[PDB]
Design a protein around this ligand. Structure first.
Ligand SMILES: [Cl-]
Ligand SMILES: [Cl-]
Lengths: 60, 55
């Protein structure tokens, strides 16, 4: 386990940006991680997307 | 290049059991650069998606 990563609840997180759209958020993430492949980039980001959608949906 | 992704499951891509696990899987794919930049990228996405989902 990588202990620098803790569970992030489906609420706004201070000290990190918020973008106009998921499109924009992907654009800005790609600027920070421009090297390495489009495939790996989407796997990383969409894996997070899918996970967060499931977490949000499963709550009450 | 990119298009807006709705706050729904994307069948082409994996799903993980927790946001910790999804961050770990993302860091395996992108081990370079600072923790700060990694989080700016991933939490920027988190914040954006949360805001759409919350209202
Ligand atoms: Cl850990
Ligand atoms: Cl890290």
């Amino acid at each position: 386990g990588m202990s620098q990563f803790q569970e992030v609840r489906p609420v706004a997180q201070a000290l990190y940006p918020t973008h106009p759209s998921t499109k924009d958020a992907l654009e800005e993430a790609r600027l920070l991680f421009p090297g390495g492949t489009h495939h790996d980039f989407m796997r990383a980001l969409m894996g997070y997307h899918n996970t967060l959608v499931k977490v949000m949906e499963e709550q009450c």
